[PDB]
Design a binder for this molecule. Structure first.
Ligand SMILES: Nc1nc2c(c(CN[C@H]3C=C[C@H](O)[C@@H]3O)cn2[C@@H]2O[C@H](COP(=O)(O)O)[C@@H](O)[C@H]2O)c(=O)[nH]1
Length: 315
């Protein structure tokens, strides 16, 4: 466990007061999923950009640099190619739209200088993308780090990882401040690395596990601790919430980042996915943790009306 995600999150799950795993539900869900050999959907080619290897690598870094927090009222929505999108697909569509119209979002020099008005345009739609100013700041940071340390080419970073997913995550968090996703729980560091790990899985997807998307150790990735997958796990009965936390989610009350409740959700998400992975493998359906994450995130796109709302964090 070379990044320390499973180890540090396990300490949280063992001590967690507001969240816990129902291991019976894990078994039952594993039974049904294994029975019908459920598979994550293939990496989406419609709403993701495609290009030569240098531009594509840079595109994946930018996509995942700003891959966070899409909730808020009035709901942020995007119109692209005769369809309306929200959440992640709104992000994806927005970038694809910008690149098609020839915005140089894969060029480090442009990213280093990108303005608030640039990103407001790129993500123009109904409402406004949350944390707009932050996204502008992250893209400027991303650009100037690319330019300074990687000759403007994320492919330089990828090459230095030598086909290790774990090594690339560590290269990314070392160089790019925005990707440093750790917190504390009762005085101990907890390590998550959501966006850094999702980046690696997205290279694998975009490059079909060849060239720059070749990795020999993808099993070492964890789930990407977000707000949608815990909502799915709660829906499937795998995550249970204590009274005050349940009521907070129901009221759509925001939870401060790094607070005990929030850290417990994220840790239990990691271990909820890991426990489902082990239970599936037990029943002869071997998937990597990132695949179980993909599969659950996909289920999260068509949850029934009146499932408990996902938790709302911000920072
Ligand atoms: N754990 C996990 N979290 C994911 C993703 C994705 C998209 N990945 C694509 C690439 C390969 C897969 O097959 C997917 O097609 C976005 N997110 C996070 O979810 C939230 C937005 O959710 P919603 O409102 O539904 O759009 C937000 O925190 C966002 O950062 C997934 O991979 N796993």
């Amino acid at each position: 466990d070379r990044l320390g995600v499973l180890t540090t999150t396990r300490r949280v799950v063992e001590q967690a007061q507001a969240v816990w795993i129902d291991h019976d539900a894990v078994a039952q869900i594993a039974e049904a999923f294994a029975a019908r050999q459920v598979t994550p959907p293939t990496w989406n080619r419609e709403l993701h950009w495609s290009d030569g290897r240098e531009a594509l690598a840079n595109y994946i870094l930018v996509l995942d640099a700003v891959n966070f927090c899409f909730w808020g009222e009035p709901r942020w929505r995007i119109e692209y190619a005769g369809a309306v999108y929200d959440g992640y697909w709104a992000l994806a569509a927005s970038l694809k739209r910008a690149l098609e119209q020839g915005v140089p979002l894969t060029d480090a020099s442009y990213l280093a200088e990108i303005t608030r008005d640039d990103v407001a345009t790129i993500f123009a739609g109904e409402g406004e993308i949350p944390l707009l100013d932050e996204r502008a700041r992250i893209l400027r940071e991303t650009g100037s780090v690319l330019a300074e340390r990687f000759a403007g080419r994320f492919s330089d970073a990828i090459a230095a990882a030598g086909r290790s997913a774990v090594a690339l995550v560590d290269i990314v968090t070392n160089a790019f401040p925005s990707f440093r996703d750790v917190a504390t729980y009762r005085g101990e560091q907890v390590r998550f690395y959501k966006r850094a790990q999702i980046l690696v899985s997205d290279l694998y997807g975009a490059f079909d596990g060849s060239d720059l998307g070749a990795f020999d150790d993808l099993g070492e990735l964890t789930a990407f601790a977000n707000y949608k997958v815990p909502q799915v796990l709660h829906h499937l009965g795998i995550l249970r919430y204590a009274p005050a936390l349940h009521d907070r989610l129901a009221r759509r009350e925001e939870i401060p980042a790094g607070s005990p409740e929030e850290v417990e959700i994220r840790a239990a998400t990691i271990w909820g996915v890991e426990e489902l992975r082990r239970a599936l493998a037990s029943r002869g359906h071997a998937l990597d943790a990132y695949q179980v994450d993909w599969l659950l995130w996909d289920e999260g796109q068509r949850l029934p009306a009146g499932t408990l709302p996902y938790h709302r964090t911000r920072t």
